[PDB]
Amino acid sequence: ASNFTQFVLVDNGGTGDVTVAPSNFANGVAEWISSNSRSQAYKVTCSVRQSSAQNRKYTIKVEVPKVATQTVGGVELPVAAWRSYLNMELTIPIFATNSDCELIVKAMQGLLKDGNPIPSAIAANSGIY
Amino acid sequence: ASNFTQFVLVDNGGTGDVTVAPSNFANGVAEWISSNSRSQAYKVTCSVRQSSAQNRKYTIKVEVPKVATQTVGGVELPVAAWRSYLNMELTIPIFATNSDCELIVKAMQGLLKDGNPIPSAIAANSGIY
Amino acid sequence: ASNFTQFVLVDNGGTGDVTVAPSNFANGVAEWISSNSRSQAYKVTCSVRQSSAQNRKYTIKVEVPKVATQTVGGVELPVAAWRSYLNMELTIPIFATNSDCELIVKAMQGLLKDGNPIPSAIAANSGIY
């Protein structure tokens, strides 16, 4: 066990799956990037710090690039036309059991399950109503 | 559409599921709450605004009760020993089409799929190693 | 479910019932007015805010108009000769269960039930003695 492993970030059903792999842990920040140039890569980072005396805080970030090829100076360079940024902070009391922590993980994945309100809004460029 | 409905936040497989239902919409912030006192409820909120000239941000917040040794309906203090707080900000460029937003949603749910490192670190009360 | 619905404010037994309907929610204040001109309408507003860290506070207001027709500049305008103002604030601890909250609602309606002391005093232009 070492949980610092590769995983598939975007499952496009076997074909065109975006999978991300361990790439750095300098300064206590675990980083995973996809197999692209650093200019076009998906990136995921994660770090935990004991924020208060009684809390721990996980900070997770995801960058999703829209790839493009730009001509700069008559030369074509692999580029990301824009990136989208997910940025999440989770603060957990030190008194939380592993069963308590599993509840948090289940709530977070239920939140984004296909068909529930929030994933639907995002995917439609809509708000909730 | 009409996104604002009840949904299952924690799926404990049929029995013991936690459903969260619409409870407030003041200021266009959709709130969903579970059937509990506000001090012990699972609570979810979501809102969207154009954050900059080039971006929109979804702000999503979740609060999850510490359940081990909970006294249902009891007055449990300090509040911070008994609650976890999730805070997600998703910044999406105004150029993103719906297909782009679909992919962002898939990246978000891939991050948290069971077995992948971030959910299993959280659930095991751990960092990355 | 959306609890923002129309309701009858004054039940004059089917005939001359004053009924009030959703009319605004700007700034998180739910407003209902009766079907009159805005100068002669009954108005009801309601808003909830988390006042303290451990409290929530509901602020409910009702305006009851005494309608009249006034001649201003030789022209007759629909007007309210005076309005009566009910103004109530309810502060509930976050530790209150839904069964605890039902008790509050039952106490508030018992307070104003026909024949109990306070409704009798108001209706008679009397104090309590």
Add this chain to the structure above:
Amino acid sequence: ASNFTQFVLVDNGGTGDVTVAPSNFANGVAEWISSNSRSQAYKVTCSVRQSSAQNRKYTIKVEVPKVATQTVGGVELPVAAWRSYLNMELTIPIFATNSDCELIVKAMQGLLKDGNPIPSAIAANSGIY
């Protein structure tokens, strides 16, 4: 008349009713209390004065105990975690006849009838949505 009598504040239909009885009249403020310690009692007070040259105000206050997980007769601290406070001010113009005051009472009890939005938001621990 003689308004100042006992009445049923919470009608749980015969069995489990909460009756509140006259308990103080210092300064012409009628107080009614239930049969409990003053820290756990249902308490009601009511007074009336001419607030301005044109108006009278009834000030009515209710305190309701948090009952889930209550220890009867116990010392429960903090007081604020265990109590809800209602505060109503009714301003009625000096022109209002008794019929007018009857209607104001009906508006007040319509606001709180079961099924109408404000009582059902409160009881469900919710805002308007």
Add this chain to the structure above:
Amino acid sequence: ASNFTQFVLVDNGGTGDVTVAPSNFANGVAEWISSNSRSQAYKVTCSVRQSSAQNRKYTIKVEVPKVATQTVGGVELPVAAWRSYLNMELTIPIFATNSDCELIVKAMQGLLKDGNPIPSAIAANSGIY
């Protein structure tokens, strides 16, 4: 009950219809936006406020994009080549009953009815002649 919902802004047949869906209601400004890239989206907003003691004033705004692709340096972005901007202010005295408001609405839709002088001048890049 809610009027903050999705609706058809352009019935352009029953297929190329443009629909606008609720997006944000911050600060008393209801905003609706069509789907896909916000950069090419139609936008409608509406807000009502008591402009004077006697008047309420609605401000309604609509933006109609000309859809296009910007290509700069080989990078293509979905953009609006330009937008037409409708902006309208409707002032209504508080003495208007609901029937007077219906008439104001019929005047507005008569003004723009198909075949009448103003809609057909606009539709033809033309003035009055």
Add this chain to the structure above:
Amino acid sequence: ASNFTQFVLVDNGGTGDVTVAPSNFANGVAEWISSNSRSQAYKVTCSVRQSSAQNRKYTIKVEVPKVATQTVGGVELPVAAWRSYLNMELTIPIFATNSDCELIVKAMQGLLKDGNPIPSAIAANSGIY
């Protein structure tokens, strides 16, 4: 050929219809006024001008009178008790073809179509909720 003609501003059935007929076209402002006393008349004006190098801007204005009789000193005059004032500005870039103008017109009439949120909020003295 002429579009400066009489037209129906309110089809209020096929009988109480309000028709507005050309009155004056001085200084590039087309004005139409309904018949009988100018004091109780509906008024519509429209003017188009090149607001910028790239834009033409239509200004359309409508006034809806509440008909009434002023009686002062025993002398009665037909007056408008008050007027609602619609004022709209539509900016269209010179690149719009006639088809783009038709679409702008369909957006305008969709906005005010019967049953959609803005016309029905106005019609009911209401905001968005």
